[PDB]
Design a protein around this ligand. Structure first.
Ligand code: B3N
Ligand code: K
Ligand code: K
Ligand code: ZN
Length: 354
């Protein structure tokens, strides 16, 4: 039960060229390796997602088009930034998340990590929010081979609408998203009213949150929701999206989190002793994201880490204090405690149906 770390130098090299996050993959891995955290993990090279494997969520027509315009007329229908090789990066990140879910199927590990995953916005025939393949959905569909109820927990700044779409009609996968919700803020869905459809009704959980929330109140919310969800839903496996665009310093400049608050949520989840699929996602302060997921990886390992950033490839990007610790910004928390409590109340009423 040592954790699986999905990594290979060709895969980090492939990801570090994803145009919206330049060299984030390598900054994350390098930080992780400079701390020697990779020596406490079983390193598994990722497979590339087979076309049959991608088609278990995405349509063949969309999978056709994406691959073609990766090698202009019909691109608008699918929501296409058609970059030369996009299909190959998308498939590689997809296979990386499927590789990790497969290890968890084989009892190889109890925790498998693909920090370069988490592209939660993509719909079955539509790119969205810079996502071209929904590797999270792909990883859940692989987990459905053994596990009969999966809990998806999405802690990105944004609503995981794509994953919640994929399963909004079923009761075998419950989606839980904490996200900024505000008129005009992408993707604009995921109110506490959004609970799903038909047989899946009350199996989407949405926790809409305002700007400026910090560690302690984030965790009280996340633990209150998760505690009830665990009783009502009783999942057998967990997929966890831990995008870092909630952390102070992020250009998104919305939440005011530090990785310790996120790490507490992860620690509460890890205590369920279930199979668990760790993914990344957003995070547009590259060193802060590297800081966050390095810290989260130490949480998973239960190790300790010194505060000084080790000397390594990207040390210069860790100004000004060159430490692991992220300091919140002097910004107002805009979360009325009573709006939060009503949300919790509404969600408990939705969960009692389960
Ligand atoms: C500086 N610049 C050119 C831009 C800055 C922000 C956006 C944006 O938020 N667009 C809406 C799409 C947000 C998706 C973010 C991906 C994510 O973190 N998903 O969880 C666009 C352009
Ligand atoms: K989220
Ligand atoms: K569902
Ligand atoms: Zn995001």
């Amino acid at each position: 039960l040592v954790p699986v770390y999905i990594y290979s130098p060709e895969y980090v090299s492939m990801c570090d060229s994803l145009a919206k996050i330049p060299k984030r993959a390598s900054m994350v891995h390098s930080l992780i390796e400079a701390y020697a955290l990779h020596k406490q993990m079983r390193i598994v090279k990722p497979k590339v997602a087979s076309m049959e494997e991608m088609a278990t969520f995405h349509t063949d027509a969309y999978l056709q088009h994406l691959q073609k315009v990766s090698q202009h007329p019909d691109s608008i229908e699918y929501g296409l930034p058609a970059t030369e090789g996009i299909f190959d990066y998308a498939a590689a990140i997809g296979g990386a998340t499927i590789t990790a879910a497969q290890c968890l199927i084989d009892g190889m590990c109890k925790v498998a990590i693909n920090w370069s995953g988490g592209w939660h916005h993509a719909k079955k025939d539509e790119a969205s929010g810079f996502c071209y393949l929904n590797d999270a959905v792909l990883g859940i569909l692989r987990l459905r081979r053994k596990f009969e109820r999966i809990l998806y927990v999405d802690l990105d700044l944004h609503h995981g609408d794509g994953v919640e779409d994929a399963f909004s009609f079923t009761s075998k996968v419950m989606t839980v998203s904490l996200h900024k919700f505000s008129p005009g803020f992408f993707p604009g869905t995921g109110d506490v009213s959004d609970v799903g459809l038909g047989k899946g009704r009350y199996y989407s959980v949405n926790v809409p949150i305002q700007d400026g929330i910090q560690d302690e109140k984030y965790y009280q919310i996340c633990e209150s929701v998760l505690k009830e969800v665990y009783q009502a839903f009783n999942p057998k496996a967990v997929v966890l999206q831990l995008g870092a665009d909630t952390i102070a310093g992020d250009p998104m400049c919305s939440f005011n989190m530090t990785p310790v608050g996120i790490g507490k949520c992860l620690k509460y989840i890890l205590q369920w002793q279930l199979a668990t699929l760790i993914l990344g996602g957003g995070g547009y302060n590259l060193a802060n994201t590297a800081r966050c997921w390095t810290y989260l990886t130490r949480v998973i390992l239960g190790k300790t880490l010194s505060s000084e950033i080790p000397d390594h490839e990207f040390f210069t990007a860790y100004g000004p204090d060159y430490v692991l610790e992220i300091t919140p910004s002097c910004r107002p928390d805009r979360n009325e405690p009573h709006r939060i409590q009503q949300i919790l109340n509404y969600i408990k009423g939705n969960l009692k149906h389960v």
